[PDB]
């Protein structure tokens, strides 16, 4: 897959709106993931005790981890597909330490798309949605290929 230049423009234009409140977006994405797919919370030893959404929102450490996640993701998107070097340390930890199947990346992709709609009702159009889905799909496919290069089945 390949994005057009105009699609990357839409992606980066939307990302500038994420960067204006990274913690608010990161916390919302994690909570959306955990409510929609509670099997994913069990991978997080530090947060697995959180049970209701109200608990999650008051957890300072969950919000900080949201920043960690979106910070890494934004660095990758900003490379517009030339991201082999940023992917490697990410692929290495999530395949071999955290043991995250690629299916869980699809789930966080859907959570990102939902939170962008919830947080930007008027800005996040169909074309922007399309471009973001493609950027995230590319991310998932290249990470699945790095899994295999490390000898893992994602
Ligand atoms: C956009 C997708 C994602 C990005 C950019 C991302 C990024 C990161 C980063 C930067 C870290 C900290 C350092 C590290 O261990 O690598 C981390 C930790 C972690 N990630 Fe992810 N991640 C993503 C998706 C996921 C998903 C979907 C899961 C599981 C459902 C997951 C599971 C974990 C776990 C379990 C840790 C360790 C948490 C801790 O500090 O105790 N990641 N991630």
């Amino acid at each position: 897959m390949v994005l057009s230049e105009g699609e990357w423009q839409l992606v980066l234009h939307v990302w500038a709106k994420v960067e204006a409140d990274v913690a608010g977006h990161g916390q919302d994405i994690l909570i959306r993931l955990f409510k929609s797919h509670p099997e994913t919370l069990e991978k997080f030893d530090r947060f697995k005790h959180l049970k209701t959404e109200a608990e999650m929102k008051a957890s300072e450490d969950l919000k900080k981890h949201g920043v960690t996640v979106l910070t890494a993701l934004g660095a990758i998107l900003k490379k517009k597909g030339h991201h082999e070097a940023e992917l490697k340390p990410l692929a290495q930890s999530h395949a071999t330490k955290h043991k995250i199947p690629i299916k869980y990346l699809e789930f966080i992709s859907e959570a990102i798309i939902h939170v962008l709609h919830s947080r930007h009702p008027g800005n996040f159009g169909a074309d922007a949605q399309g471009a973001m889905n493609k950027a995230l799909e590319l991310f998932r496919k290249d990470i699945a290929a790095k899994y295999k290069e490390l000898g893992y089945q994602g």
Side-chain angles (χ1 to χ4, degrees), residues 96-125:
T96 73
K97 182 147 168 36
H98 313 317
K99 313 262 198 50
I100 305 310
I102 306 293
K103 181 54 70 132
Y104 287 5
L105 297 197
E106 313 169 1
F107 296 156
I108 200 161
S109 298
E110 298 166 358
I112 290 160
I113 292 293
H114 182 273
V115 162
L116 295 168
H117 279 294
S118 322
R119 278 181 159 262
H120 312 276
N123 304 155
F124 197 48

PDB file of all heavy atoms in Angstrom, residues 96-125:
ATOM      1  N   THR A  96       7.868  -9.459  21.533  1.00  0.00           N
ATOM      2  CA  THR A  96       8.657 -10.361  22.384  1.00  0.00           C
ATOM      3  C   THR A  96       8.493 -10.124  23.863  1.00  0.00           C
ATOM      4  O   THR A  96       8.664 -11.071  24.645  1.00  0.00           O
ATOM      5  CB  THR A  96      10.163 -10.300  22.070  1.00  0.00           C
ATOM      6  OG1 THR A  96      10.735  -9.089  22.553  1.00  0.00           O
ATOM      7  CG2 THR A  96      10.415 -10.403  20.632  1.00  0.00           C
ATOM      8  N   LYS A  97       8.181  -8.899  24.292  1.00  0.00           N
ATOM      9  CA  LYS A  97       7.972  -8.671  25.714  1.00  0.00           C
ATOM     10  C   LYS A  97       6.493  -8.663  26.097  1.00  0.00           C
ATOM     11  O   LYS A  97       6.063  -9.436  26.961  1.00  0.00           O
ATOM     12  CB  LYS A  97       8.664  -7.359  26.114  1.00  0.00           C
ATOM     13  CG  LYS A  97       8.565  -7.009  27.593  1.00  0.00           C
ATOM     14  CD  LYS A  97       9.849  -6.271  28.069  1.00  0.00           C
ATOM     15  CE  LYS A  97       9.703  -5.642  29.467  1.00  0.00           C
ATOM     16  NZ  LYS A  97       8.863  -6.463  30.412  1.00  0.00           N
ATOM     17  N   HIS A  98       5.707  -7.765  25.493  1.00  0.00           N
ATOM     18  CA  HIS A  98       4.299  -7.653  25.837  1.00  0.00           C
ATOM     19  C   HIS A  98       3.467  -8.779  25.238  1.00  0.00           C
ATOM     20  O   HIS A  98       2.408  -9.081  25.770  1.00  0.00           O
ATOM     21  CB  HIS A  98       3.807  -6.288  25.358  1.00  0.00           C
ATOM     22  CG  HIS A  98       4.717  -5.168  25.737  1.00  0.00           C
ATOM     23  ND1 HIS A  98       5.289  -5.074  26.987  1.00  0.00           N
ATOM     24  CD2 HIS A  98       5.129  -4.073  25.052  1.00  0.00           C
ATOM     25  CE1 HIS A  98       6.054  -3.995  27.043  1.00  0.00           C
ATOM     26  NE2 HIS A  98       5.968  -3.367  25.884  1.00  0.00           N
ATOM     27  N   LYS A  99       3.908  -9.361  24.113  1.00  0.00           N
ATOM     28  CA  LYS A  99       3.224 -10.430  23.365  1.00  0.00           C
ATOM     29  C   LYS A  99       1.825 -10.023  22.887  1.00  0.00           C
ATOM     30  O   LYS A  99       0.850 -10.653  23.205  1.00  0.00           O
ATOM     31  CB  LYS A  99       3.143 -11.720  24.182  1.00  0.00           C
ATOM     32  CG  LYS A  99       4.454 -12.142  24.849  1.00  0.00           C
ATOM     33  CD  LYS A  99       5.182 -13.201  24.037  1.00  0.00           C
ATOM     34  CE  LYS A  99       6.244 -13.965  24.866  1.00  0.00           C
ATOM     35  NZ  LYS A  99       5.730 -14.499  26.179  1.00  0.00           N
ATOM     36  N   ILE A 100       1.785  -9.017  22.022  1.00  0.00           N
ATOM     37  CA  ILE A 100       0.563  -8.378  21.536  1.00  0.00           C
ATOM     38  C   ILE A 100       0.311  -8.885  20.116  1.00  0.00           C
ATOM     39  O   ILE A 100       1.110  -8.571  19.210  1.00  0.00           O
ATOM     40  CB  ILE A 100       0.721  -6.844  21.534  1.00  0.00           C
ATOM     41  CG1 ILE A 100       1.126  -6.319  22.933  1.00  0.00           C
ATOM     42  CG2 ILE A 100      -0.527  -6.125  20.966  1.00  0.00           C
ATOM     43  CD1 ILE A 100       0.239  -6.833  24.094  1.00  0.00           C
ATOM     44  N   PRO A 101      -0.763  -9.631  19.868  1.00  0.00           N
ATOM     45  CA  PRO A 101      -1.088  -9.994  18.483  1.00  0.00           C
ATOM     46  C   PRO A 101      -1.502  -8.773  17.687  1.00  0.00           C
ATOM     47  O   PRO A 101      -2.033  -7.795  18.219  1.00  0.00           O
ATOM     48  CB  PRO A 101      -2.271 -10.968  18.623  1.00  0.00           C
ATOM     49  CG  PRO A 101      -2.920 -10.548  19.907  1.00  0.00           C
ATOM     50  CD  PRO A 101      -1.816 -10.070  20.818  1.00  0.00           C
ATOM     51  N   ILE A 102      -1.375  -8.912  16.365  1.00  0.00           N
ATOM     52  CA  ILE A 102      -1.722  -7.825  15.464  1.00  0.00           C
ATOM     53  C   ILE A 102      -3.204  -7.477  15.582  1.00  0.00           C
ATOM     54  O   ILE A 102      -3.584  -6.305  15.462  1.00  0.00           O
ATOM     55  CB  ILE A 102      -1.318  -8.187  14.016  1.00  0.00           C
ATOM     56  CG1 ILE A 102       0.175  -8.582  13.927  1.00  0.00           C
ATOM     57  CG2 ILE A 102      -1.628  -6.983  13.090  1.00  0.00           C
ATOM     58  CD1 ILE A 102       1.128  -7.350  14.229  1.00  0.00           C
ATOM     59  N   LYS A 103      -4.051  -8.459  15.933  1.00  0.00           N
ATOM     60  CA  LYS A 103      -5.479  -8.204  16.147  1.00  0.00           C
ATOM     61  C   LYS A 103      -5.724  -7.103  17.186  1.00  0.00           C
ATOM     62  O   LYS A 103      -6.681  -6.321  17.076  1.00  0.00           O
ATOM     63  CB  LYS A 103      -6.161  -9.509  16.620  1.00  0.00           C
ATOM     64  CG  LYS A 103      -7.611  -9.386  16.854  1.00  0.00           C
ATOM     65  CD  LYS A 103      -8.292  -8.817  15.624  1.00  0.00           C
ATOM     66  CE  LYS A 103      -8.278  -9.834  14.480  1.00  0.00           C
ATOM     67  NZ  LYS A 103      -9.642  -9.959  13.863  1.00  0.00           N
ATOM     68  N   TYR A 104      -4.855  -7.012  18.179  1.00  0.00           N
ATOM     69  CA  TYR A 104      -5.025  -5.977  19.198  1.00  0.00           C
ATOM     70  C   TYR A 104      -4.659  -4.615  18.648  1.00  0.00           C
ATOM     71  O   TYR A 104      -5.269  -3.637  19.046  1.00  0.00           O
ATOM     72  CB  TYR A 104      -4.211  -6.316  20.451  1.00  0.00           C
ATOM     73  CG  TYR A 104      -4.799  -7.472  21.313  1.00  0.00           C
ATOM     74  CD1 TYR A 104      -5.924  -8.194  20.895  1.00  0.00           C
ATOM     75  CD2 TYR A 104      -4.203  -7.824  22.530  1.00  0.00           C
ATOM     76  CE1 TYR A 104      -6.440  -9.257  21.695  1.00  0.00           C
ATOM     77  CE2 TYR A 104      -4.680  -8.878  23.310  1.00  0.00           C
ATOM     78  CZ  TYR A 104      -5.799  -9.600  22.869  1.00  0.00           C
ATOM     79  OH  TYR A 104      -6.290 -10.606  23.647  1.00  0.00           O
ATOM     80  N   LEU A 105      -3.786  -4.550  17.628  1.00  0.00           N
ATOM     81  CA  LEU A 105      -3.503  -3.278  16.962  1.00  0.00           C
ATOM     82  C   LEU A 105      -4.686  -2.792  16.131  1.00  0.00           C
ATOM     83  O   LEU A 105      -4.872  -1.567  15.948  1.00  0.00           O
ATOM     84  CB  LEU A 105      -2.290  -3.412  16.055  1.00  0.00           C
ATOM     85  CG  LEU A 105      -1.003  -3.752  16.811  1.00  0.00           C
ATOM     86  CD1 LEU A 105       0.167  -3.442  15.859  1.00  0.00           C
ATOM     87  CD2 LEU A 105      -0.839  -2.997  18.035  1.00  0.00           C
ATOM     88  N   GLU A 106      -5.398  -3.730  15.491  1.00  0.00           N
ATOM     89  CA  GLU A 106      -6.636  -3.374  14.799  1.00  0.00           C
ATOM     90  C   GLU A 106      -7.633  -2.777  15.779  1.00  0.00           C
ATOM     91  O   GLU A 106      -8.246  -1.748  15.500  1.00  0.00           O
ATOM     92  CB  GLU A 106      -7.227  -4.599  14.088  1.00  0.00           C
ATOM     93  CG  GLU A 106      -6.184  -5.360  13.287  1.00  0.00           C
ATOM     94  CD  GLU A 106      -6.645  -6.729  12.784  1.00  0.00           C
ATOM     95  OE1 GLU A 106      -7.813  -7.101  13.035  1.00  0.00           O
ATOM     96  OE2 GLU A 106      -5.823  -7.425  12.139  1.00  0.00           O
ATOM     97  N   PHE A 107      -7.741  -3.357  16.972  1.00  0.00           N
ATOM     98  CA  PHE A 107      -8.646  -2.804  17.978  1.00  0.00           C
ATOM     99  C   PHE A 107      -8.233  -1.394  18.402  1.00  0.00           C
ATOM    100  O   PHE A 107      -9.077  -0.525  18.568  1.00  0.00           O
ATOM    101  CB  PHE A 107      -8.683  -3.699  19.233  1.00  0.00           C
ATOM    102  CG  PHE A 107      -9.229  -5.085  19.001  1.00  0.00           C
ATOM    103  CD1 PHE A 107      -8.876  -6.127  19.874  1.00  0.00           C
ATOM    104  CD2 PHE A 107     -10.087  -5.361  17.943  1.00  0.00           C
ATOM    105  CE1 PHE A 107      -9.376  -7.410  19.666  1.00  0.00           C
ATOM    106  CE2 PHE A 107     -10.591  -6.650  17.764  1.00  0.00           C
ATOM    107  CZ  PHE A 107     -10.217  -7.648  18.614  1.00  0.00           C
ATOM    108  N   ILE A 108      -6.946  -1.137  18.603  1.00  0.00           N
ATOM    109  CA  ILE A 108      -6.608   0.248  19.012  1.00  0.00           C
ATOM    110  C   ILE A 108      -6.774   1.236  17.852  1.00  0.00           C
ATOM    111  O   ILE A 108      -6.994   2.442  18.078  1.00  0.00           O
ATOM    112  CB  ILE A 108      -5.207   0.333  19.617  1.00  0.00           C
ATOM    113  CG1 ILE A 108      -5.095   1.627  20.450  1.00  0.00           C
ATOM    114  CG2 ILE A 108      -4.144   0.286  18.551  1.00  0.00           C
ATOM    115  CD1 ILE A 108      -3.989   1.629  21.417  1.00  0.00           C
ATOM    116  N   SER A 109      -6.626   0.763  16.609  1.00  0.00           N
ATOM    117  CA  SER A 109      -6.926   1.578  15.432  1.00  0.00           C
ATOM    118  C   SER A 109      -8.379   2.034  15.431  1.00  0.00           C
ATOM    119  O   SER A 109      -8.678   3.225  15.217  1.00  0.00           O
ATOM    120  CB  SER A 109      -6.599   0.777  14.166  1.00  0.00           C
ATOM    121  OG  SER A 109      -5.207   0.493  14.164  1.00  0.00           O
ATOM    122  N   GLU A 110      -9.309   1.101  15.681  1.00  0.00           N
ATOM    123  CA  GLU A 110     -10.724   1.473  15.747  1.00  0.00           C
ATOM    124  C   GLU A 110     -10.982   2.450  16.892  1.00  0.00           C
ATOM    125  O   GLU A 110     -11.761   3.407  16.734  1.00  0.00           O
ATOM    126  CB  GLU A 110     -11.588   0.212  15.906  1.00  0.00           C
ATOM    127  CG  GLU A 110     -11.389  -0.682  14.689  1.00  0.00           C
ATOM    128  CD  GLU A 110     -11.913  -2.089  14.867  1.00  0.00           C
ATOM    129  OE1 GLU A 110     -12.415  -2.415  15.974  1.00  0.00           O
ATOM    130  OE2 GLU A 110     -11.813  -2.859  13.879  1.00  0.00           O
ATOM    131  N   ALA A 111     -10.324   2.240  18.046  1.00  0.00           N
ATOM    132  CA  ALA A 111     -10.457   3.191  19.151  1.00  0.00           C
ATOM    133  C   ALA A 111      -9.958   4.598  18.781  1.00  0.00           C
ATOM    134  O   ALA A 111     -10.597   5.614  19.121  1.00  0.00           O
ATOM    135  CB  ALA A 111      -9.754   2.642  20.372  1.00  0.00           C
ATOM    136  N   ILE A 112      -8.844   4.687  18.046  1.00  0.00           N
ATOM    137  CA  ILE A 112      -8.359   5.994  17.629  1.00  0.00           C
ATOM    138  C   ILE A 112      -9.394   6.668  16.736  1.00  0.00           C
ATOM    139  O   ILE A 112      -9.705   7.855  16.916  1.00  0.00           O
ATOM    140  CB  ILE A 112      -6.996   5.871  16.922  1.00  0.00           C
ATOM    141  CG1 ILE A 112      -5.940   5.500  17.934  1.00  0.00           C
ATOM    142  CG2 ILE A 112      -6.674   7.213  16.210  1.00  0.00           C
ATOM    143  CD1 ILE A 112      -4.726   4.911  17.282  1.00  0.00           C
ATOM    144  N   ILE A 113      -9.960   5.922  15.775  1.00  0.00           N
ATOM    145  CA  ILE A 113     -10.902   6.541  14.818  1.00  0.00           C
ATOM    146  C   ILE A 113     -12.148   7.034  15.544  1.00  0.00           C
ATOM    147  O   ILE A 113     -12.638   8.143  15.299  1.00  0.00           O
ATOM    148  CB  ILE A 113     -11.265   5.554  13.690  1.00  0.00           C
ATOM    149  CG1 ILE A 113     -10.065   5.284  12.798  1.00  0.00           C
ATOM    150  CG2 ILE A 113     -12.444   6.095  12.857  1.00  0.00           C
ATOM    151  CD1 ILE A 113      -9.611   6.482  12.003  1.00  0.00           C
ATOM    152  N   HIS A 114     -12.632   6.245  16.518  1.00  0.00           N
ATOM    153  CA  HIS A 114     -13.790   6.631  17.319  1.00  0.00           C
ATOM    154  C   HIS A 114     -13.514   7.869  18.193  1.00  0.00           C
ATOM    155  O   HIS A 114     -14.369   8.752  18.315  1.00  0.00           O
ATOM    156  CB  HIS A 114     -14.201   5.456  18.187  1.00  0.00           C
ATOM    157  CG  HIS A 114     -15.412   5.730  19.010  1.00  0.00           C
ATOM    158  ND1 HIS A 114     -15.350   6.326  20.252  1.00  0.00           N
ATOM    159  CD2 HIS A 114     -16.719   5.521  18.754  1.00  0.00           C
ATOM    160  CE1 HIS A 114     -16.574   6.478  20.723  1.00  0.00           C
ATOM    161  NE2 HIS A 114     -17.419   5.997  19.832  1.00  0.00           N
ATOM    162  N   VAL A 115     -12.345   7.944  18.822  1.00  0.00           N
ATOM    163  CA  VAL A 115     -12.071   9.086  19.693  1.00  0.00           C
ATOM    164  C   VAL A 115     -11.897  10.337  18.848  1.00  0.00           C
ATOM    165  O   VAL A 115     -12.225  11.436  19.305  1.00  0.00           O
ATOM    166  CB  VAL A 115     -10.850   8.846  20.599  1.00  0.00           C
ATOM    167  CG1 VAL A 115     -10.256  10.227  21.225  1.00  0.00           C
ATOM    168  CG2 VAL A 115     -11.173   7.762  21.768  1.00  0.00           C
ATOM    169  N   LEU A 116     -11.399  10.206  17.615  1.00  0.00           N
ATOM    170  CA  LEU A 116     -11.232  11.417  16.802  1.00  0.00           C
ATOM    171  C   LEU A 116     -12.581  11.950  16.384  1.00  0.00           C
ATOM    172  O   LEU A 116     -12.785  13.180  16.329  1.00  0.00           O
ATOM    173  CB  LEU A 116     -10.352  11.142  15.594  1.00  0.00           C
ATOM    174  CG  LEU A 116      -8.898  10.771  15.824  1.00  0.00           C
ATOM    175  CD1 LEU A 116      -8.288  10.237  14.505  1.00  0.00           C
ATOM    176  CD2 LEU A 116      -8.105  11.952  16.378  1.00  0.00           C
ATOM    177  N   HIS A 117     -13.529  11.035  16.103  1.00  0.00           N
ATOM    178  CA  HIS A 117     -14.905  11.477  15.869  1.00  0.00           C
ATOM    179  C   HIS A 117     -15.508  12.092  17.122  1.00  0.00           C
ATOM    180  O   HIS A 117     -16.194  13.103  17.047  1.00  0.00           O
ATOM    181  CB  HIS A 117     -15.785  10.327  15.357  1.00  0.00           C
ATOM    182  CG  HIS A 117     -15.637  10.063  13.892  1.00  0.00           C
ATOM    183  ND1 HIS A 117     -16.020  10.966  12.931  1.00  0.00           N
ATOM    184  CD2 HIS A 117     -15.111   9.007  13.227  1.00  0.00           C
ATOM    185  CE1 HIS A 117     -15.761  10.470  11.729  1.00  0.00           C
ATOM    186  NE2 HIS A 117     -15.206   9.281  11.880  1.00  0.00           N
ATOM    187  N   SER A 118     -15.262  11.518  18.290  1.00  0.00           N
ATOM    188  CA  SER A 118     -15.922  12.059  19.474  1.00  0.00           C
ATOM    189  C   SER A 118     -15.361  13.410  19.832  1.00  0.00           C
ATOM    190  O   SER A 118     -16.094  14.260  20.355  1.00  0.00           O
ATOM    191  CB  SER A 118     -15.760  11.145  20.681  1.00  0.00           C
ATOM    192  OG  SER A 118     -15.833   9.809  20.258  1.00  0.00           O
ATOM    193  N   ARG A 119     -14.068  13.630  19.551  1.00  0.00           N
ATOM    194  CA  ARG A 119     -13.399  14.827  20.020  1.00  0.00           C
ATOM    195  C   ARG A 119     -13.380  15.932  18.991  1.00  0.00           C
ATOM    196  O   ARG A 119     -13.114  17.079  19.361  1.00  0.00           O
ATOM    197  CB  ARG A 119     -11.964  14.527  20.459  1.00  0.00           C
ATOM    198  CG  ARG A 119     -11.927  13.977  21.867  1.00  0.00           C
ATOM    199  CD  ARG A 119     -10.532  13.721  22.284  1.00  0.00           C
ATOM    200  NE  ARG A 119     -10.376  13.670  23.728  1.00  0.00           N
ATOM    201  CZ  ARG A 119      -9.966  14.690  24.463  1.00  0.00           C
ATOM    202  NH1 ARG A 119      -9.710  15.862  23.894  1.00  0.00           N
ATOM    203  NH2 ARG A 119      -9.840  14.538  25.766  1.00  0.00           N
ATOM    204  N   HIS A 120     -13.659  15.616  17.721  1.00  0.00           N
ATOM    205  CA  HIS A 120     -13.653  16.610  16.644  1.00  0.00           C
ATOM    206  C   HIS A 120     -14.878  16.458  15.737  1.00  0.00           C
ATOM    207  O   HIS A 120     -14.745  16.240  14.536  1.00  0.00           O
ATOM    208  CB  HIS A 120     -12.343  16.526  15.858  1.00  0.00           C
ATOM    209  CG  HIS A 120     -11.150  16.495  16.752  1.00  0.00           C
ATOM    210  ND1 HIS A 120     -10.572  17.641  17.262  1.00  0.00           N
ATOM    211  CD2 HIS A 120     -10.485  15.454  17.310  1.00  0.00           C
ATOM    212  CE1 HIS A 120      -9.594  17.311  18.091  1.00  0.00           C
ATOM    213  NE2 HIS A 120      -9.512  15.988  18.128  1.00  0.00           N
ATOM    214  N   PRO A 121     -16.102  16.631  16.273  1.00  0.00           N
ATOM    215  CA  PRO A 121     -17.319  16.333  15.472  1.00  0.00           C
ATOM    216  C   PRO A 121     -17.489  16.984  14.082  1.00  0.00           C
ATOM    217  O   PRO A 121     -18.362  16.572  13.313  1.00  0.00           O
ATOM    218  CB  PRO A 121     -18.456  16.806  16.395  1.00  0.00           C
ATOM    219  CG  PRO A 121     -17.918  16.741  17.759  1.00  0.00           C
ATOM    220  CD  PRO A 121     -16.429  16.986  17.661  1.00  0.00           C
ATOM    221  N   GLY A 122     -16.678  17.962  13.724  1.00  0.00           N
ATOM    222  CA  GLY A 122     -17.012  18.891  12.674  1.00  0.00           C
ATOM    223  C   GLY A 122     -15.832  18.932  11.754  1.00  0.00           C
ATOM    224  O   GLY A 122     -15.935  19.311  10.589  1.00  0.00           O
ATOM    225  N   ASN A 123     -14.697  18.514  12.298  1.00  0.00           N
ATOM    226  CA  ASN A 123     -13.424  18.503  11.604  1.00  0.00           C
ATOM    227  C   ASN A 123     -13.113  17.176  10.931  1.00  0.00           C
ATOM    228  O   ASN A 123     -12.478  17.157   9.870  1.00  0.00           O
ATOM    229  CB  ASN A 123     -12.300  18.842  12.584  1.00  0.00           C
ATOM    230  CG  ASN A 123     -12.517  20.153  13.268  1.00  0.00           C
ATOM    231  OD1 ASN A 123     -12.020  20.390  14.372  1.00  0.00           O
ATOM    232  ND2 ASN A 123     -13.261  21.028  12.611  1.00  0.00           N
ATOM    233  N   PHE A 124     -13.569  16.068  11.491  1.00  0.00           N
ATOM    234  CA  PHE A 124     -13.080  14.766  11.073  1.00  0.00           C
ATOM    235  C   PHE A 124     -14.050  14.167  10.052  1.00  0.00           C
ATOM    236  O   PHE A 124     -14.868  13.299  10.357  1.00  0.00           O
ATOM    237  CB  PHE A 124     -12.873  13.899  12.314  1.00  0.00           C
ATOM    238  CG  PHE A 124     -12.014  12.718  12.062  1.00  0.00           C
ATOM    239  CD1 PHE A 124     -10.802  12.857  11.401  1.00  0.00           C
ATOM    240  CD2 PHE A 124     -12.457  11.470  12.399  1.00  0.00           C
ATOM    241  CE1 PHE A 124     -10.021  11.749  11.147  1.00  0.00           C
ATOM    242  CE2 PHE A 124     -11.692  10.332  12.130  1.00  0.00           C
ATOM    243  CZ  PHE A 124     -10.473  10.481  11.479  1.00  0.00           C
ATOM    244  N   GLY A 125     -13.913  14.616   8.805  1.00  0.00           N
ATOM    245  CA  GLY A 125     -14.759  14.174   7.708  1.00  0.00           C
ATOM    246  C   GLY A 125     -14.493  12.747   7.212  1.00  0.00           C
ATOM    247  O   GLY A 125     -13.604  12.046   7.674  1.00  0.00           O
TER     248      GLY A 125
END
